[PDB]
Design a protein around this nucleic acid. Sequence first.
RNA 1: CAACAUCUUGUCAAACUAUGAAUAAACAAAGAAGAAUUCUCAGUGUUAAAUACACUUCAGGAAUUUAAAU
RNA 2: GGCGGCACAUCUGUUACAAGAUAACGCAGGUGUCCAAAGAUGAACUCAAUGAGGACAGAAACCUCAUGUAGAAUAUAAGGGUAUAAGUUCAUUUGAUUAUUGAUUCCAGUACAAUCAAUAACUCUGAAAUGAUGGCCUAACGAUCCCUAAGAUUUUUAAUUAG
RNA 3: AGGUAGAUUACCUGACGUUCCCAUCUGUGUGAACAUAAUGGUACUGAUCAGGCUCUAAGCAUCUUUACUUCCGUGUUCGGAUGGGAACGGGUGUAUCCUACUUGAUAUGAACCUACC
Lengths: 57, 60, 165, 170
Amino acid sequence: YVPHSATRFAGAGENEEALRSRILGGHVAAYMKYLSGEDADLYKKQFGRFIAAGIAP
Amino acid sequence: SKDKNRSSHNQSHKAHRNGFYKPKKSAYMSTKGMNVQVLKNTKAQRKFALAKKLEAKKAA
Amino acid sequence: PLSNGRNRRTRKLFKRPFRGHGLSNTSTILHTYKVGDYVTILCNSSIQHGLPYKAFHGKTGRVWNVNPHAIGVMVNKKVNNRIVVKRLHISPEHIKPSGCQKDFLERKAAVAAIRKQNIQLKKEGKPLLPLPAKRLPKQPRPAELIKGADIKFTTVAPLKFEELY
Amino acid sequence: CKSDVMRKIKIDKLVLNISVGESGDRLTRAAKVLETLTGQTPVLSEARYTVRAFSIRNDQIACHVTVRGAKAAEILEKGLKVKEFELKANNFSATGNFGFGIEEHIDLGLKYDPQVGIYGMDFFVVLARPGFRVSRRKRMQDKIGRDHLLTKEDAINWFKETYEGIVLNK
RNA sequence: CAACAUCUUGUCAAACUAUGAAUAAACAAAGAAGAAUUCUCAGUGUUAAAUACACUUCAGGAAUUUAAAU
RNA sequence: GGCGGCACAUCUGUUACAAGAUAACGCAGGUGUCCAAAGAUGAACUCAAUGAGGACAGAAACCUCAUGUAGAAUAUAAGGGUAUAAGUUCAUUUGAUUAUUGAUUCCAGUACAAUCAAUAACUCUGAAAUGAUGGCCUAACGAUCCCUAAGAUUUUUAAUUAG
RNA sequence: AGGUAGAUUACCUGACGUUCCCAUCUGUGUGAACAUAAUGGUACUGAUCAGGCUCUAAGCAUCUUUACUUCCGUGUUCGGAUGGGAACGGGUGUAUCCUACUUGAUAUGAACCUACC
């Protein structure tokens, strides 16, 4: 039990799925599938070790 | 006709004739304005011990 | 002739200690006061809310009640020819743990240590140790010998008056 | 592998200020030229002390703005080329900054109006090194070292390389 | 020249002060009734729950030692 | 004595003598107000000044860096307090509310007035711990009788039906 | 050795320079979304390309400062008490208490819980 109010999580706007997706790395996953769409050197610079380790978005 | 306004002369001598009356021990043992929960705990136990003691007196 | 204000004549009494301004210690709010303890009222001018009266500054009192944010303190006040009991509720920022019984408290420990041994010796048969000797004023010093092998002599006489100019 | 890459002097902030002695209309015009010059809306400034000799304490007086990064580089190029890279050696502060001023905002000549008139502008260039954040961060705010901090001569050499503009000692 | 910095020099403050006495002020030096220890131990409440802790005639009860503490 | 003044209710420093009390028509001053924010809370920032620079611009306008223990500001007189604030800016809000206790300051231990510690509501701010019963503290004020406003639906009953 | 939280709050501060990073910390890259402002400078978020350059931490110096110690000096002042001395003013003797500024010597932190090297 940690006293709090649910108006400062990743929601507080949009809805629960906005918070839930960010809990599951939704913003990171959507970054690569956007960065890869635009450029390749930009995608390699930002996620260099992600590409090498084999972590798909 | 001016007068002398005030003097402490012979006031400590007067105060020590029948000297500083100390408060009794009953003054230090008062419990007014104490903690509400602490007061509730004491009253709850004093009612528990009193009832048990009065029941034994009633049986005999 | 002074005025009858609540905090009159506190230019030096209520001033903070030199290089002692700003926030206070953290142990001030962490110290655990219990009923029966001895405390010292020390009005901290940095906290204007709940500031005790200037007459109780430096007075030593006994804790009589503990409240969620304030500590009850009971001190003695002197009136015309009698003494009255003053009951106050003071936040920990204005009181201080008194050390009046520091000497007394260690004497109880010294006696309790000896008494605890006297229950380890009587049943086992060994002679029982005695309690520590009571305090006494500085007694007259006894006779003693002073060796003449490591002694030295310096003569004492009135000094000839020498001018400082 | 030398750590000289962490001492690369670079521009971190460029401030342009239009200080006029009147509130309203003219300030609404001086602020509009800075929105076209830089692309971002400026901030108005109010007087600090009222003086009847200057006819000026809650009234807007000036309008400055700061630009950083690649955007500040080209605006500095435009401002310097007006002076033709002719900066005196007395224009460099002891802290490593320097500045100058212009009389007429060249702006744009296609759509020009007499309503906006002619405004004078000042330029101030604040240099930095990679590692200057320690004095600006909220947590663990510290002081940059003396050797890391720039000087008047450290700014002169930087200005004499990236723009090749000579410095007059007259 | 002056001025401004900086190092010395002479003399001062009831409405200036770092430091700070002598004299003083208020405590303690054993009264829920003159101590201490061991065993046992209950009602409320604090608490995450408490066997911790707080108050309850140092709740209560029984033994042993004990008249000591300028 | 009169005339002058208020030492008549009152606050600050000093006289005042390192606890408390404390004189003079002693000294230097102050009060009969002001505030929907200048109350409450949360966040951000750091003030005065000096040095070096920038068009007009100069001793005083605005901008930038560095040093900057408060030398600024805090409604007021003086003295205290205050720097990730109690100062400045922004945002929300009305706790500047209702009811009941027990204390402290003048105290005759009377009233008035002020200063607090809790409890029961309903709320404000904040993520939260907390904070909030007016203004950072010490002055900013008022009996009996009379007049004039606000409050006493909680609950207890009577009559008639069914058991 | 380092990092988080601290308690004592300058033996911990300030100035001039110096030493490593092997882990950690920091600085470092970016701006799509939460969120941010005039400025991705701050704060926010995503990351790991390089660096010990500043931080941070450890040490240096007839270093200012600060904290202990002797000395200053039983000097200033002070409680008690004369049919003591002096025209005053002020100043003894007796039995007692005894600062401060200054200078000289030393130090430049000690210490608690959790994780990782």
